[PDB]
Design a protein around this nucleic acid. Structure first.
Ligand code: FAD
Length: 501
DNA sequence: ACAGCGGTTGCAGGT
DNA sequence: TACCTGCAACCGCTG
Protein backbone atom coordinates (compact mmCIF):
# COMPACT_ATOMS: atom_id res chain seq x y z
CA UNK A 1 0.00 0.00 0.00
CA UNK A 2 0.85 3.66 -0.37
CA UNK A 3 0.27 6.25 2.40
CA UNK A 4 -2.01 9.27 2.62
CA UNK A 5 -0.81 11.88 5.13
CA UNK A 6 -2.70 14.72 6.76
CA UNK A 7 -0.43 17.24 8.44
CA UNK A 8 -1.97 18.99 11.47
CA UNK A 9 -0.42 22.35 12.40
CA UNK A 10 -3.46 24.44 13.17
CA UNK A 11 -6.80 22.80 12.35
CA UNK A 12 -6.46 20.59 15.42
CA UNK A 13 -9.97 19.18 14.99
CA UNK A 14 -11.88 16.52 13.05
CA UNK A 15 -14.99 18.63 12.36
CA UNK A 16 -15.05 20.98 9.34
CA UNK A 17 -11.64 19.88 8.17
CA UNK A 18 -11.70 19.45 4.39
CA UNK A 19 -7.97 18.61 4.23
CA UNK A 20 -8.43 15.73 6.69
CA UNK A 21 -11.76 14.62 5.19
CA UNK A 22 -10.15 14.45 1.72
CA UNK A 23 -7.70 11.84 3.04
CA UNK A 24 -10.42 9.79 4.79
CA UNK A 25 -12.86 9.74 1.85
CA UNK A 26 -9.99 8.91 -0.53
CA UNK A 27 -9.03 5.91 1.64
CA UNK A 28 -12.61 4.60 1.92
CA UNK A 29 -13.11 5.16 -1.84
CA UNK A 30 -10.36 2.58 -2.51
CA UNK A 31 -10.40 0.21 0.47
CA UNK A 32 -7.24 -1.88 0.88
CA UNK A 33 -5.19 0.53 -1.21
CA UNK A 34 -3.85 3.02 1.33
CA UNK A 35 -2.59 3.52 4.85
CA UNK A 36 -3.69 6.75 6.56
CA UNK A 37 -1.27 8.75 8.78
CA UNK A 38 -2.67 11.84 10.53
CA UNK A 39 0.46 13.56 11.84
CA UNK A 40 1.59 16.44 14.03
CA UNK A 41 5.25 17.40 13.82
CA UNK A 42 6.82 18.42 17.12
CA UNK A 43 10.29 20.01 17.29
CA UNK A 44 11.54 19.00 20.78
CA UNK A 45 14.20 21.76 20.71
CA UNK A 46 11.71 24.61 21.29
CA UNK A 47 10.14 23.14 24.47
CA UNK A 48 12.35 25.47 26.56
CA UNK A 49 12.06 28.47 24.17
CA UNK A 50 10.84 31.37 26.31
CA UNK A 51 8.19 32.66 23.87
CA UNK A 52 5.85 29.77 24.70
CA UNK A 53 4.75 29.82 28.35
CA UNK A 54 3.85 26.73 30.35
CA UNK A 55 0.07 27.33 30.16
CA UNK A 56 0.08 27.23 26.34
CA UNK A 57 2.22 24.05 26.29
CA UNK A 58 -0.37 22.40 28.55
CA UNK A 59 -3.14 23.51 26.19
CA UNK A 60 -1.31 21.93 23.24
CA UNK A 61 -0.62 18.74 25.25
CA UNK A 62 -4.32 18.47 26.04
CA UNK A 63 -5.31 19.28 22.46
CA UNK A 64 -3.05 16.56 21.05
CA UNK A 65 -4.49 13.99 23.51
CA UNK A 66 -8.06 14.92 22.51
CA UNK A 67 -7.18 14.75 18.81
CA UNK A 68 -5.74 11.26 19.29
CA UNK A 69 -8.88 10.16 21.19
CA UNK A 70 -11.15 11.42 18.40
CA UNK A 71 -9.01 9.87 15.61
CA UNK A 72 -9.15 6.56 17.53
CA UNK A 73 -12.97 6.59 17.11
CA UNK A 74 -12.40 6.65 13.33
CA UNK A 75 -10.14 3.55 13.51
CA UNK A 76 -7.05 5.74 13.24
CA UNK A 77 -4.84 7.63 15.69
CA UNK A 78 -2.58 10.66 15.85
CA UNK A 79 1.10 10.25 15.04
CA UNK A 80 3.22 12.90 16.77
CA UNK A 81 6.51 12.84 14.86
CA UNK A 82 9.40 14.52 16.63
CA UNK A 83 11.65 16.67 14.45
CA UNK A 84 11.78 19.48 11.93
CA UNK A 85 9.76 19.30 8.68
CA UNK A 86 12.97 19.69 6.61
CA UNK A 87 14.40 16.41 7.97
CA UNK A 88 11.11 14.60 8.72
CA UNK A 89 9.37 14.80 5.32
CA UNK A 90 12.21 13.39 3.14
CA UNK A 91 12.38 10.42 5.56
CA UNK A 92 8.64 9.69 5.83
CA UNK A 93 7.87 10.36 2.15
CA UNK A 94 10.28 7.50 1.39
CA UNK A 95 9.60 5.08 4.24
CA UNK A 96 5.80 5.45 4.20
CA UNK A 97 5.60 5.49 0.39
CA UNK A 98 3.53 8.67 0.54
CA UNK A 99 1.22 9.33 -2.42
CA UNK A 100 -0.57 12.43 -1.08
CA UNK A 101 -0.15 15.05 1.66
CA UNK A 102 -2.87 17.46 2.79
CA UNK A 103 -2.82 20.38 5.20
CA UNK A 104 -4.75 23.52 6.05
CA UNK A 105 -3.09 26.69 4.75
CA UNK A 106 -1.68 29.39 7.04
CA UNK A 107 -0.78 33.02 6.17
CA UNK A 108 2.01 33.51 8.70
CA UNK A 109 5.43 34.29 7.22
CA UNK A 110 7.24 31.36 8.82
CA UNK A 111 4.64 28.86 7.61
CA UNK A 112 4.64 30.39 4.10
CA UNK A 113 8.38 29.64 3.71
CA UNK A 114 8.08 26.28 5.55
CA UNK A 115 5.20 25.12 3.33
CA UNK A 116 6.83 26.36 0.12
CA UNK A 117 9.87 24.22 1.01
CA UNK A 118 7.61 21.23 1.74
CA UNK A 119 5.80 21.60 -1.59
CA UNK A 120 9.18 21.81 -3.39
CA UNK A 121 10.27 18.56 -1.75
CA UNK A 122 6.95 16.88 -2.53
CA UNK A 123 7.00 17.73 -6.24
CA UNK A 124 10.57 16.42 -6.44
CA UNK A 125 9.49 13.13 -4.82
CA UNK A 126 6.28 12.91 -6.86
CA UNK A 127 4.05 13.34 -3.81
CA UNK A 128 0.75 15.07 -4.52
CA UNK A 129 -0.12 18.00 -2.23
CA UNK A 130 -3.63 19.36 -1.66
CA UNK A 131 -4.13 22.37 0.60
CA UNK A 132 -7.36 23.84 1.97
CA UNK A 133 -8.24 27.25 3.36
CA UNK A 134 -10.35 26.52 6.46
CA UNK A 135 -8.69 28.46 9.33
CA UNK A 136 -10.68 31.53 8.26
CA UNK A 137 -14.20 32.01 6.89
CA UNK A 138 -12.88 34.12 4.01
CA UNK A 139 -9.70 33.55 2.01
CA UNK A 140 -7.47 36.66 2.43
CA UNK A 141 -6.14 36.24 -1.16
CA UNK A 142 -9.71 36.42 -2.53
CA UNK A 143 -10.61 39.44 -0.36
CA UNK A 144 -7.47 41.27 -1.52
CA UNK A 145 -8.15 40.30 -5.17
CA UNK A 146 -11.81 41.32 -4.96
CA UNK A 147 -10.56 44.67 -3.55
CA UNK A 148 -8.33 45.23 -6.62
CA UNK A 149 -5.07 43.84 -5.19
CA UNK A 150 -5.09 45.64 -1.81
CA UNK A 151 -6.04 44.51 1.71
CA UNK A 152 -8.92 46.65 3.04
CA UNK A 153 -7.67 48.84 5.93
CA UNK A 154 -11.07 49.79 7.32
CA UNK A 155 -13.61 47.37 8.77
CA UNK A 156 -16.65 48.76 6.93
CA UNK A 157 -14.85 48.38 3.58
CA UNK A 158 -13.75 44.86 4.54
CA UNK A 159 -17.39 43.93 5.28
CA UNK A 160 -18.43 45.35 1.89
CA UNK A 161 -15.97 43.05 0.16
CA UNK A 162 -16.69 39.80 2.06
CA UNK A 163 -20.44 40.27 1.55
CA UNK A 164 -19.64 39.65 -2.16
CA UNK A 165 -17.85 36.35 -1.42
CA UNK A 166 -19.23 32.85 -1.08
CA UNK A 167 -18.80 30.87 2.13
CA UNK A 168 -17.90 27.20 1.62
CA UNK A 169 -19.92 24.34 3.11
CA UNK A 170 -19.18 23.50 6.73
CA UNK A 171 -18.27 19.80 6.89
CA UNK A 172 -19.04 17.24 9.59
CA UNK A 173 -16.51 14.81 11.07
CA UNK A 174 -14.94 12.30 8.62
CA UNK A 175 -16.16 8.74 8.07
CA UNK A 176 -14.71 5.80 10.06
CA UNK A 177 -11.86 4.13 8.16
CA UNK A 178 -12.84 0.77 6.65
CA UNK A 179 -10.34 -2.08 6.16
CA UNK A 180 -7.53 -0.09 7.75
CA UNK A 181 -5.06 -2.20 9.71
CA UNK A 182 -2.35 -0.33 11.61
CA UNK A 183 0.34 0.76 9.14
CA UNK A 184 3.53 -1.28 9.34
CA UNK A 185 6.21 0.13 11.64
CA UNK A 186 8.85 2.36 10.12
CA UNK A 187 12.53 2.36 11.23
CA UNK A 188 11.76 4.79 14.06
CA UNK A 189 8.75 2.79 15.34
CA UNK A 190 10.75 -0.47 15.10
CA UNK A 191 13.26 0.98 17.60
CA UNK A 192 10.56 2.42 19.89
CA UNK A 193 6.90 1.45 19.47
CA UNK A 194 5.88 4.62 21.40
CA UNK A 195 7.92 7.00 19.18
CA UNK A 196 4.84 8.73 17.74
CA UNK A 197 2.59 8.64 20.84
CA UNK A 198 1.10 11.86 22.26
CA UNK A 199 3.50 13.79 24.47
CA UNK A 200 3.00 13.63 28.23
CA UNK A 201 2.84 16.70 30.46
CA UNK A 202 6.38 15.92 31.65
CA UNK A 203 7.59 15.72 28.06
CA UNK A 204 5.96 18.97 26.91
CA UNK A 205 5.96 21.24 29.99
CA UNK A 206 9.56 21.83 31.10
CA UNK A 207 8.59 24.62 33.54
CA UNK A 208 5.56 23.23 35.45
CA UNK A 209 5.91 25.76 38.29
CA UNK A 210 4.67 28.34 35.71
CA UNK A 211 1.34 26.46 35.30
CA UNK A 212 -1.74 28.13 36.80
CA UNK A 213 -5.27 26.79 37.28
CA UNK A 214 -6.44 24.75 34.27
CA UNK A 215 -9.46 26.98 33.51
CA UNK A 216 -9.52 26.32 29.76
CA UNK A 217 -8.70 22.68 28.88
CA UNK A 218 -7.35 22.04 25.38
CA UNK A 219 -8.97 20.22 22.50
CA UNK A 220 -11.86 20.07 20.09
CA UNK A 221 -14.14 18.27 22.55
CA UNK A 222 -13.87 21.14 25.05
CA UNK A 223 -14.14 23.71 22.22
CA UNK A 224 -17.50 22.31 21.08
CA UNK A 225 -18.79 21.95 24.67
CA UNK A 226 -17.79 25.52 25.45
CA UNK A 227 -19.34 26.90 22.24
CA UNK A 228 -22.57 24.97 22.80
CA UNK A 229 -22.76 26.30 26.37
CA UNK A 230 -22.24 29.84 25.01
CA UNK A 231 -24.90 29.40 22.30
CA UNK A 232 -27.55 28.08 24.73
CA UNK A 233 -28.62 31.59 25.81
CA UNK A 234 -29.77 32.85 22.43
CA UNK A 235 -30.83 36.23 23.84
CA UNK A 236 -27.34 36.83 25.24
CA UNK A 237 -25.85 35.77 21.90
CA UNK A 238 -28.21 37.86 19.77
CA UNK A 239 -27.86 41.06 21.87
CA UNK A 240 -24.07 40.73 22.39
CA UNK A 241 -22.19 44.06 22.23
CA UNK A 242 -18.43 43.76 22.88
CA UNK A 243 -18.07 47.26 24.36
CA UNK A 244 -20.63 46.42 27.05
CA UNK A 245 -18.79 43.34 28.32
CA UNK A 246 -16.76 43.79 31.51
CA UNK A 247 -12.92 43.50 31.59
CA UNK A 248 -12.85 42.63 35.30
CA UNK A 249 -15.78 40.36 36.01
CA UNK A 250 -14.37 37.43 37.99
CA UNK A 251 -15.98 35.09 35.44
CA UNK A 252 -15.43 35.83 31.71
CA UNK A 253 -18.01 38.19 30.20
CA UNK A 254 -17.23 36.89 26.69
CA UNK A 255 -17.05 33.39 25.16
CA UNK A 256 -13.38 32.51 25.75
CA UNK A 257 -13.41 30.63 22.44
CA UNK A 258 -10.22 32.41 21.29
CA UNK A 259 -7.74 29.68 22.29
CA UNK A 260 -9.88 27.09 20.51
CA UNK A 261 -10.17 29.29 17.41
CA UNK A 262 -6.39 30.01 17.49
CA UNK A 263 -5.49 26.28 17.57
CA UNK A 264 -8.27 25.24 15.17
CA UNK A 265 -9.92 23.12 17.89
CA UNK A 266 -13.03 25.06 16.88
CA UNK A 267 -13.91 25.86 13.29
CA UNK A 268 -14.57 29.58 12.79
CA UNK A 269 -16.88 28.62 9.89
CA UNK A 270 -18.94 26.33 12.15
CA UNK A 271 -19.14 29.02 14.84
CA UNK A 272 -20.15 31.56 12.17
CA UNK A 273 -22.87 29.19 10.92
CA UNK A 274 -24.29 28.60 14.42
CA UNK A 275 -24.47 32.35 15.13
CA UNK A 276 -26.21 33.04 11.81
CA UNK A 277 -28.91 30.47 12.74
CA UNK A 278 -29.46 32.25 16.09
CA UNK A 279 -29.60 35.74 14.55
CA UNK A 280 -32.35 34.51 12.15
CA UNK A 281 -34.33 33.34 15.21
CA UNK A 282 -33.86 36.53 17.29
CA UNK A 283 -35.65 39.66 15.96
CA UNK A 284 -33.84 41.99 18.39
CA UNK A 285 -30.10 41.54 17.67
CA UNK A 286 -26.87 43.55 17.45
CA UNK A 287 -24.86 44.15 14.26
CA UNK A 288 -21.17 44.41 13.39
CA UNK A 289 -18.81 45.82 14.53
CA UNK A 290 -20.03 45.03 18.09
CA UNK A 291 -22.03 41.81 17.61
CA UNK A 292 -20.68 38.31 18.14
CA UNK A 293 -20.55 37.70 14.39
CA UNK A 294 -18.77 41.08 14.18
CA UNK A 295 -16.00 39.74 16.45
CA UNK A 296 -15.44 36.83 14.06
CA UNK A 297 -15.24 39.39 11.24
CA UNK A 298 -12.57 41.33 13.16
CA UNK A 299 -10.57 38.11 13.22
CA UNK A 300 -11.09 37.87 9.44
CA UNK A 301 -10.14 41.53 9.02
CA UNK A 302 -6.77 41.20 10.76
CA UNK A 303 -5.94 37.95 8.96
CA UNK A 304 -6.47 39.82 5.66
CA UNK A 305 -4.24 42.84 6.41
CA UNK A 306 -1.63 40.48 7.94
CA UNK A 307 -1.68 38.24 4.86
CA UNK A 308 -0.43 41.18 2.74
CA UNK A 309 2.46 42.21 5.02
CA UNK A 310 5.26 39.86 6.18
CA UNK A 311 6.47 42.59 8.61
CA UNK A 312 3.01 42.90 10.24
CA UNK A 313 4.50 42.15 13.69
CA UNK A 314 7.04 45.05 13.71
CA UNK A 315 7.00 48.82 13.24
CA UNK A 316 9.85 49.21 10.71
CA UNK A 317 9.05 48.06 7.15
CA UNK A 318 5.35 47.64 7.98
CA UNK A 319 3.21 49.42 5.37
CA UNK A 320 0.32 49.96 7.83
CA UNK A 321 2.31 51.17 10.79
CA UNK A 322 2.87 54.71 12.03
CA UNK A 323 6.59 55.20 12.73
CA UNK A 324 6.66 56.32 16.38
CA UNK A 325 9.87 56.96 18.35
CA UNK A 326 9.12 54.61 21.28
CA UNK A 327 11.75 54.64 24.05
CA UNK A 328 13.62 51.81 25.80
CA UNK A 329 13.00 51.56 29.53
CA UNK A 330 14.12 48.18 30.96
CA UNK A 331 12.90 48.83 34.49
CA UNK A 332 9.41 50.03 33.47
CA UNK A 333 9.08 47.17 31.02
CA UNK A 334 9.97 44.66 33.72
CA UNK A 335 7.45 46.24 36.12
CA UNK A 336 4.68 46.06 33.48
CA UNK A 337 5.61 42.51 32.47
CA UNK A 338 5.31 41.23 36.04
CA UNK A 339 2.37 43.29 37.22
CA UNK A 340 4.37 45.49 39.59
CA UNK A 341 3.55 48.91 38.07
CA UNK A 342 1.86 50.04 41.25
CA UNK A 343 -1.45 50.66 39.44
CA UNK A 344 -3.53 47.88 41.00
CA UNK A 345 -5.94 47.55 38.05
CA UNK A 346 -3.02 47.12 35.62
CA UNK A 347 -1.18 44.78 37.99
CA UNK A 348 -4.28 42.64 38.54
CA UNK A 349 -4.69 42.18 34.80
CA UNK A 350 -1.03 41.35 34.19
CA UNK A 351 -1.17 38.82 37.03
CA UNK A 352 -4.36 37.16 35.71
CA UNK A 353 -2.70 36.91 32.27
CA UNK A 354 0.44 35.23 33.61
CA UNK A 355 -1.49 32.86 35.90
CA UNK A 356 -4.34 31.84 33.60
CA UNK A 357 -3.44 32.71 29.98
CA UNK A 358 -6.60 34.66 29.14
CA UNK A 359 -7.71 38.15 29.92
CA UNK A 360 -10.71 40.00 28.53
CA UNK A 361 -10.33 42.21 25.47
CA UNK A 362 -10.79 45.48 27.39
CA UNK A 363 -8.30 44.31 30.04
CA UNK A 364 -5.91 43.89 27.10
CA UNK A 365 -6.78 47.46 26.06
CA UNK A 366 -6.02 48.79 29.53
CA UNK A 367 -2.54 47.21 29.87
CA UNK A 368 -1.59 47.77 26.22
CA UNK A 369 -2.54 51.45 26.35
CA UNK A 370 -0.59 51.76 29.58
CA UNK A 371 2.58 50.21 28.14
CA UNK A 372 2.54 52.19 24.91
CA UNK A 373 0.90 55.56 24.19
CA UNK A 374 -0.93 55.95 27.48
CA UNK A 375 1.88 55.89 30.03
CA UNK A 376 5.23 54.15 29.61
CA UNK A 377 5.97 55.03 25.96
CA UNK A 378 7.39 51.55 25.31
CA UNK A 379 7.05 49.94 21.88
CA UNK A 380 4.05 47.70 21.20
CA UNK A 381 6.56 45.08 19.97
CA UNK A 382 7.61 44.56 23.63
CA UNK A 383 3.98 44.12 24.72
CA UNK A 384 3.44 41.78 21.81
CA UNK A 385 6.33 39.60 23.02
CA UNK A 386 4.95 39.27 26.55
CA UNK A 387 1.44 38.49 25.29
CA UNK A 388 2.97 35.98 22.89
CA UNK A 389 4.49 34.13 25.87
CA UNK A 390 1.45 34.21 28.20
CA UNK A 391 -1.72 33.96 26.03
CA UNK A 392 -3.35 30.61 25.28
CA UNK A 393 -4.81 32.34 22.19
CA UNK A 394 -1.49 33.83 20.99
CA UNK A 395 -2.14 34.58 17.31
CA UNK A 396 0.47 36.24 15.06
CA UNK A 397 -2.02 38.32 13.08
CA UNK A 398 -4.43 39.11 15.93
CA UNK A 399 -1.72 40.03 18.45
CA UNK A 400 0.08 42.29 15.94
CA UNK A 401 -3.09 43.99 14.67
CA UNK A 402 -4.59 44.69 18.09
CA UNK A 403 -1.23 45.92 19.48
CA UNK A 404 -1.08 48.39 16.54
CA UNK A 405 -4.68 49.39 17.24
CA UNK A 406 -4.09 50.03 20.95
CA UNK A 407 -0.83 51.93 20.35
CA UNK A 408 -2.61 54.05 17.68
CA UNK A 409 -0.05 52.79 15.16
CA UNK A 410 -2.59 51.55 12.61
CA UNK A 411 -6.38 51.22 12.21
CA UNK A 412 -7.14 53.38 15.23
CA UNK A 413 -6.05 57.03 15.23
CA UNK A 414 -8.02 58.89 17.94
CA UNK A 415 -5.04 58.96 20.38
CA UNK A 416 -6.78 61.68 22.44
CA UNK A 417 -8.88 58.81 23.89
CA UNK A 418 -6.68 57.35 26.63
CA UNK A 419 -7.73 54.68 29.12
CA UNK A 420 -7.28 55.68 32.74
CA UNK A 421 -5.51 52.96 34.75
CA UNK A 422 -7.38 54.33 37.80
CA UNK A 423 -10.91 55.02 36.46
CA UNK A 424 -11.51 52.49 33.65
CA UNK A 425 -12.08 49.40 35.83
CA UNK A 426 -14.35 51.22 38.29
CA UNK A 427 -17.28 51.30 35.89
CA UNK A 428 -17.73 47.56 36.04
CA UNK A 429 -16.09 46.68 39.43
CA UNK A 430 -16.65 49.58 41.89
CA UNK A 431 -15.74 47.41 44.89
CA UNK A 432 -12.51 46.23 43.19
CA UNK A 433 -13.23 42.47 43.64
CA UNK A 434 -10.93 41.72 40.68
CA UNK A 435 -8.03 43.63 42.25
CA UNK A 436 -8.64 41.97 45.64
CA UNK A 437 -8.39 38.56 43.91
CA UNK A 438 -5.28 39.15 41.76
CA UNK A 439 -3.45 41.65 43.99
CA UNK A 440 -4.32 40.09 47.36
CA UNK A 441 -1.84 42.27 49.28
CA UNK A 442 -4.35 45.12 48.69
CA UNK A 443 -7.43 43.08 49.62
CA UNK A 444 -8.29 45.02 52.82
CA UNK A 445 -8.14 48.50 51.19
CA UNK A 446 -11.46 50.34 51.03
CA UNK A 447 -12.97 50.64 47.53
CA UNK A 448 -12.33 54.39 47.84
CA UNK A 449 -8.60 53.96 47.37
CA UNK A 450 -7.98 50.41 46.20
CA UNK A 451 -7.57 51.70 42.60
CA UNK A 452 -5.30 54.53 43.81
CA UNK A 453 -3.59 53.34 47.00
CA UNK A 454 -1.08 56.25 46.99
CA UNK A 455 -3.97 58.35 48.35
CA UNK A 456 -3.91 56.31 51.61
CA UNK A 457 -2.06 57.77 54.64
CA UNK A 458 0.75 55.66 56.15
CA UNK A 459 -1.40 54.89 59.23
CA UNK A 460 -4.20 53.70 56.92
CA UNK A 461 -1.80 51.57 54.83
CA UNK A 462 -0.62 49.89 58.04
CA UNK A 463 -4.22 49.39 59.18
CA UNK A 464 -4.89 47.69 55.80
CA UNK A 465 -1.87 45.39 56.16
CA UNK A 466 0.01 46.68 53.11
CA UNK A 467 2.57 49.50 53.16
CA UNK A 468 3.47 51.05 49.83
CA UNK A 469 7.10 50.53 48.93
CA UNK A 470 7.30 47.34 51.02
CA UNK A 471 4.28 45.08 50.43
CA UNK A 472 3.17 46.63 47.10
CA UNK A 473 5.21 48.97 44.89
CA UNK A 474 5.05 52.74 44.55
CA UNK A 475 3.53 53.72 41.21
CA UNK A 476 6.23 53.79 38.52
CA UNK A 477 4.79 56.82 36.66
CA UNK A 478 2.11 59.46 37.26
CA UNK A 479 -0.68 58.82 34.75
CA UNK A 480 -2.17 62.29 35.21
CA UNK A 481 1.12 63.84 33.95
CA UNK A 482 2.57 61.38 31.43
CA UNK A 483 -0.57 60.67 29.36
CA UNK A 484 -0.85 64.39 28.46
CA UNK A 485 2.81 64.56 27.44
CA UNK A 486 2.38 61.36 25.42
CA UNK A 487 -0.65 62.79 23.55
CA UNK A 488 1.72 65.57 22.38
CA UNK A 489 4.37 63.02 21.37
CA UNK A 490 1.70 61.12 19.39
CA UNK A 491 0.61 64.30 17.60
CA UNK A 492 4.24 65.10 16.78
CA UNK A 493 4.88 61.61 15.41
CA UNK A 494 1.68 61.72 13.29
CA UNK A 495 2.86 65.05 11.76
CA UNK A 496 6.27 63.57 10.84
CA UNK A 497 4.51 60.57 9.28
CA UNK A 498 2.07 62.82 7.33
CA UNK A 499 5.02 64.77 5.94
CA UNK A 500 6.81 61.61 4.76
CA UNK A 501 3.41 60.47 3.41
C1' DA B 1 -9.27 69.30 -3.95
C1' DC B 2 -10.03 69.32 0.35
C1' DA B 3 -14.27 69.53 3.68
C1' DG B 4 -17.26 66.65 6.07
C1' DC B 5 -18.31 62.25 7.81
C1' DG B 6 -17.91 57.95 10.72
C1' DG B 7 -14.72 55.38 13.31
C1' DT B 8 -15.84 47.85 18.10
C1' DT B 9 -14.67 49.56 23.57
C1' DG B 10 -11.99 57.79 26.85
C1' DC B 11 -12.56 60.82 30.83
C1' DA B 12 -14.80 64.08 33.78
C1' DG B 13 -18.56 66.38 35.08
C1' DG B 14 -23.28 67.01 34.45
C1' DT B 15 -28.46 66.11 33.94
C1' DT C 1 -30.61 54.92 33.06
C1' DA C 2 -28.43 56.29 29.50
C1' DC C 3 -27.16 59.89 27.44
C1' DC C 4 -25.11 64.85 27.05
C1' DT C 5 -21.18 68.24 26.72
C1' DG C 6 -16.25 69.79 26.30
C1' DC C 7 -11.79 68.46 25.78
C1' DA C 8 -9.07 69.09 20.90
C1' DA C 9 -8.56 67.28 16.71
C1' DC C 10 -6.47 62.13 14.42
C1' DC C 11 -7.17 58.88 10.18
C1' DG C 12 -9.27 56.80 5.55
C1' DC C 13 -13.10 57.34 2.63
C1' DT C 14 -16.20 59.93 -0.19
C1' DG C 15 -17.93 62.99 -3.58
C1 FAD D 1 -3.33 44.05 22.77
C2 FAD D 1 -4.22 42.96 22.23
C3 FAD D 1 -3.67 41.73 21.85
C4 FAD D 1 -4.49 40.68 21.43
N1 FAD D 1 -3.95 39.45 21.06
C5 FAD D 1 -4.77 38.41 20.65
C6 FAD D 1 -4.25 37.16 20.26
O1 FAD D 1 -3.04 36.94 20.20
N2 FAD D 1 -5.11 36.16 19.86
C7 FAD D 1 -6.47 36.36 19.83
O2 FAD D 1 -7.21 35.45 19.49
N3 FAD D 1 -6.99 37.59 20.18
C8 FAD D 1 -6.16 38.61 20.60
N4 FAD D 1 -6.72 39.83 20.97
C9 FAD D 1 -8.11 40.13 20.46
C10 FAD D 1 -9.18 39.87 21.53
O3 FAD D 1 -8.88 40.55 22.72
C11 FAD D 1 -9.37 38.39 21.87
O4 FAD D 1 -9.58 37.62 20.70
C12 FAD D 1 -10.57 38.21 22.79
O5 FAD D 1 -10.28 38.78 24.06
C13 FAD D 1 -10.84 36.73 22.96
O6 FAD D 1 -11.81 36.49 23.96
P1 FAD D 1 -13.20 35.77 23.58
O7 FAD D 1 -12.90 34.50 22.85
O8 FAD D 1 -14.03 35.61 24.83
O9 FAD D 1 -13.79 36.87 22.56
P2 FAD D 1 -15.32 37.05 22.04
O10 FAD D 1 -15.68 38.48 22.34
O11 FAD D 1 -16.27 36.05 22.63
O12 FAD D 1 -15.20 36.89 20.45
C14 FAD D 1 -15.24 35.64 19.80
C15 FAD D 1 -14.03 35.46 18.90
O13 FAD D 1 -13.90 36.56 18.00
C16 FAD D 1 -12.55 36.86 17.79
N5 FAD D 1 -12.25 38.21 18.29
C17 FAD D 1 -12.83 38.86 19.34
N6 FAD D 1 -12.24 40.06 19.47
C18 FAD D 1 -11.30 40.20 18.51
C19 FAD D 1 -10.40 41.21 18.19
N7 FAD D 1 -10.42 42.41 18.81
N8 FAD D 1 -9.54 41.02 17.13
C20 FAD D 1 -9.56 39.85 16.40
N9 FAD D 1 -10.45 38.84 16.71
C21 FAD D 1 -11.29 39.02 17.76
C22 FAD D 1 -11.74 35.83 18.57
O14 FAD D 1 -11.39 34.73 17.76
C23 FAD D 1 -12.71 35.43 19.66
O15 FAD D 1 -12.46 34.17 20.22
C24 FAD D 1 -5.88 40.86 21.39
C25 FAD D 1 -6.41 42.09 21.78
C26 FAD D 1 -5.60 43.13 22.20
C27 FAD D 1 -6.27 44.39 22.66
Amino acid sequence: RSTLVHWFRKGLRLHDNPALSHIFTAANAAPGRYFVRPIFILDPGILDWMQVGANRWRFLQQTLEDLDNQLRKLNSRLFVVRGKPAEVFPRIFKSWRVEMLTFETDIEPYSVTRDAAVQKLAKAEGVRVETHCSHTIYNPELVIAKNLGKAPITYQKFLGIVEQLKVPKVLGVPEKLKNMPTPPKDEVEQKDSAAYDCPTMKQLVKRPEELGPNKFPGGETEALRRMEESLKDEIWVARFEKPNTAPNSLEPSTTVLSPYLKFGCLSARLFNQKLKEIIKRQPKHSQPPVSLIGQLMWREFYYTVAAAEPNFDRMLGNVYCMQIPWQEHPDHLEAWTHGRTGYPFIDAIMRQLRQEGWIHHLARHAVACFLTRGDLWISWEEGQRVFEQLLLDQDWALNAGNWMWLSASAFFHQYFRVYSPVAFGKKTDPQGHYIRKYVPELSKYPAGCIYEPWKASLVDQRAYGCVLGTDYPHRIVKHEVVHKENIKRMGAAYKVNREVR
